[PDB]
Paper text:
We report the crystal structures of cFSP1 (residues 12–373, hereafter named cFSP1ΔN) in its substrate-free and ubiquinone (CoQ1)-bound forms at 2.0 and 2.6 Å resolution, respectively. The structure of the ubiquinone-bound form was obtained by co-crystallizing cFSP1ΔN with ubiquinone Q1 (CoQ1) in the absence of NAD(P)H. In both substrate-free and CoQ1-bound structures, each asymmetric unit contains one cFSP1ΔN molecule, and their structures are virtually identical (r.m.s. deviation of ~0.4 Å), with the exception of a loop 327–337 at CTD, which assumes two different conformations even though it is partially disordered and displays weak density, suggesting a role in regulating substrate access to the active site. The peteridine moiety of the isoalloxazine ring is located in a canonical active site for ubiquinone substrate binding (hereafter named ubiquinone-binding pocket), which is mainly formed by residues 293–298 of α10, residues 327–331 and 354–362 from CTD, residues 340–350 from CTD of the other chain in the dimer, where one CoQ1 molecule is clearly buried in. The CoQ1 interacts with cFSP1 by mainly hydrophobic interactions with residues forming the ubiquinone-binding pocket, including Ala294, Tyr295, residues 327–329, Phe359, Lys362 and two residues (Val340 and Leu348) from the other chain of the dimer. Moreover, the head group of CoQ1 interacts with the FAD through a hydrogen bond between the O4 atom of CoQ1 and N3 atoms of FAD. The mutation of Leu329 (Leu330 in hFSP1), which is positioned at the entrance loop for the substrate CoQ1, probably reduces the binding activity to CoQ. Notably, in these two structures, cFSP1ΔN molecule forms a dimer with its crystallographic symmetric molecule. The interactions between the two cFSP1 monomers are mainly mediated through its CTD.
Ferroptosis suppressor protein 1 (FSP1, also known as AIMF2, AMID or PRG3) is a recently identified glutathione-independent ferroptosis suppressor, but its underlying structural mechanism remains unknown. FSP1 is recently identified as a breakthrough owing to its unique ability to suppress ferroptosis by reducing ubiquinone to ubiquinol, or vitamin K to reduced hydroquinone (VKH2). The overall structure of cFSP1ΔN adopts a glutathione reductase-like fold and is also composed of three domains, a FAD-binding domain (FBD, residues 12–141, and 241–318) harboring a FAD molecule, a NAD(P)H-binding domain (NBD, residues 142–240) and a C-terminal domain (CTD, residues 319–373).
Numbering used by the authors:
A (entry chain A), B (entry chain A): 11 to 373
The structure:
Amino acid sequence: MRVVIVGGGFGGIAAASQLKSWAVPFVLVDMRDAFHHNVAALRASVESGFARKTFISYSVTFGDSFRQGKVVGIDPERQQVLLSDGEELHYSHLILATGSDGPFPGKFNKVIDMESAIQTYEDMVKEIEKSERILVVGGGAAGVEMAAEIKTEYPAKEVTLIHSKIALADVELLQSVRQEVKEILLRKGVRLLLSEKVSNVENLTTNQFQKDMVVRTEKGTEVVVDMVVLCTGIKINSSAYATAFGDKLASNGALNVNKHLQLEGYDNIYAIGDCANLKEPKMAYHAELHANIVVSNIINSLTHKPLKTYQPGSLTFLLSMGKNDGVGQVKGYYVGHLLVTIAKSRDLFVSKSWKTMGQPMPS
Amino acid sequence: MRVVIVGGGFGGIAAASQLKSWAVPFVLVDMRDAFHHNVAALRASVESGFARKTFISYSVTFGDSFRQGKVVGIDPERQQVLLSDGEELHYSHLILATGSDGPFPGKFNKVIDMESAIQTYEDMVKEIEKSERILVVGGGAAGVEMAAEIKTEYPAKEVTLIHSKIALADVELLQSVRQEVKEILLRKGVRLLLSEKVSNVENLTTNQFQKDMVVRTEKGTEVVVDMVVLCTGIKINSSAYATAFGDKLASNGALNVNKHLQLEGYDNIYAIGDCANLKEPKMAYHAELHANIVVSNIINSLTHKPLKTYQPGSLTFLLSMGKNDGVGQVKGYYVGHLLVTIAKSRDLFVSKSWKTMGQPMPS
Ligand SMILES: Cc1cc2nc3c(=O)[nH]c(=O)nc-3n(C[C@H](O)[C@H](O)[C@H](O)COP(=O)(O)OP(=O)(O)OC[C@H]3O[C@@H](n4cnc5c(N)ncnc54)[C@H](O)[C@@H]3O)c2cc1C
Ligand SMILES: Cc1cc2nc3c(=O)[nH]c(=O)nc-3n(C[C@H](O)[C@H](O)[C@H](O)COP(=O)(O)OP(=O)(O)OC[C@H]3O[C@@H](n4cnc5c(N)ncnc54)[C@H](O)[C@@H]3O)c2cc1C
Ligand SMILES: COC1=C(OC)C(=O)C(CC=C(C)C)=C(C)C1=O
Ligand SMILES: COC1=C(OC)C(=O)C(CC=C(C)C)=C(C)C1=O
């Protein structure tokens, strides 16, 4: 038997670790040969020597249970995974954990070797460093995070964020959280340009230092900057499975799953992470929880025992520390519960990834 | 000098305590002669002997610095507070903390003495007890909380909730929190009736046991129950100040305040709590924070020192205990922060009120 995991992100490495613990034969497949803590990618492109902490070699940990490859198709009837080099992997169980894609520097999903990947980000740090005037296109989570990490490292640099809606960030965040985001950006000195779209986006020289660039909006507004960073429009990454399930995807590219995280019409295909069409925020935190359920259900498949049901409201959360970071803000109430915000760890959880992967964090 | 506080709720008693600590002369004015932990009112009307924990005598604590009265007008030019018994109180500083009003059992803002108030709720417990079939009108926070406290105490009772929108609870809650509310109600056995409004609401016999009552909606739908509980439409309570500031209120009845919580055109009137028009969730937790700022600024008024600014994002929150209740759910992320839900204390924070008021909780 063989569990093939397509996608070695937060979901895929959590499921690969467990399958290794359970001694279940598997192959993890990913475009890169290293994992990318994508949550800390924006910092990786601003702070020197930091991208080295955001990429972990797959083969040091998983050995020959890893195969670098770009999946271009899935044959669910013959149970084959089709790579772009013409090769095929047979599976008994398929876990799809393809996550989300979008422009560099926020996402980095391409065929590339760990050293070039790190050096792609270290080149970006130095082009940021050269630029006194930076435009960041797009005001979602990637754009906001990019803006704030520039003024963090370079408080005197002029950063500008342009966004096509009325408020920053994601509609499914509280209008008072979006507004809080607007105000954390203003406190840092980031100048905003809301409700207007860049025109001729395609013609911009991006990720490079270029003195006196002129960006025109659709409103005719003009700003002059020394560098454009593109943070427009992160989508679910359906490239690996669109040909197989295209008719049947959700509107946003995600896969429909039953309560055991199996694909609607298949007992031996599962989806986890961003690519699963679940009514819940697409986070790395949940992808690990999805992984836990899907490996459970592969084992129960083997032992002809009842499948476990992914309970979205899993209470697997405790303040990371013991009064070392107690303070929290209150943001709402409803029956039995209180909406609260807490601060993200300052290392952006990188230490966890190195632990999951069983490698010393480099220095 | 005299600080007159109109409204002795969470805001008003927090500001009265502090003014007593600061030895600043004040008069607290409230309709009732007891404070009402309104957050635990719905439980008070379901669980026997519990309403006695939700009302605290004002005069045991504040003495003659308390005056029972219903304020019917404010003269901000002569600095007079006008009571319904014809009497007038002069002030040097006015704190308006009038909160929110709406139907019993959720709110209880009327001229009444502590013992009748408790006995009004203990009568409701017994009418709930008599009823096998309960309709709760309205699916906001009061309706949802009422539904869930009935099935809590009486798991076999049939409770029905009817609401006029598409999802339970408040639009400014996350669509996945509203949906979580929908599902906490379904897990308890509460039958929902969404997107339809009761017709002829006025003709219903409410808060009383009446076998075989027939409620018709505007859709023509019919349900037969033994009791109607009304939880429709909590508004800001502008009764004390509408005549003075009517032209100038916000759309929802709240008072516009500067960053020091003073009313727009007055240096000696402040608003705190629900009645302040601040971009933040109307909670008891924030009203105490508003109180802290407004008493600070009355002192700074006395010492000709700079006014403090109410920072909405005040980080005055630490998990109530030390690992005694660590687990929390994750519900989102944005720059620097994580949306999390935590469980409300099971006593609904009643102990705090008795502490603030310096009285032994009765038993
Ligand atoms: C700015 C920002 C900040 C964030 N912060 C947080 C945070 O603090 N906490 C949090 O929990 N979440 C956070 N997130 C969300 C988080 O990054 C994602 O939800 C998470 O990465 C989902 O993991 P995954 O396993 O589903 O997929 P991913 O981690 O996106 O991994 C998918 C993998 O699949 C591979 N792949 C895809 N298609 C193919 C193919 N055809 N062939 C081969 N390989 C393929 C890709 O190369 C990639 O390695 C943030 C997101 C952004 C943009
Ligand atoms: C079901 C439900 C659950 C809730 N749960 C929570 C929770 O867990 N946590 C939380 O923080 N918040 C919670 N809230 C919100 C909370 O109850 C209110 O935000 C809070 O009471 C606001 O306090 P306040 O001081 O502004 O006014 P209130 O506590 O409403 O007090 C106002 C007072 O003013 C008096 N008054 C008004 N007009 C006059 C007048 N003209 N003359 C004399 N006296 C007058 C009234 O008698 C009343 O005593 C909940 C609300 C509901 C409905
Ligand atoms: C970066 O991905 C993430 C994790 O895995 C490394 C987490 O464990 C967690 C959970 C951490 C707790 C303390 C909330 C979060 C929130 C997360 O975003
Ligand atoms: C009932 O009113 C309330 C308070 O005062 C009694 C609080 O202190 C608090 C704060 C409690 C912490 C632990 C979140 C909340 C949430 C509240 O709702």
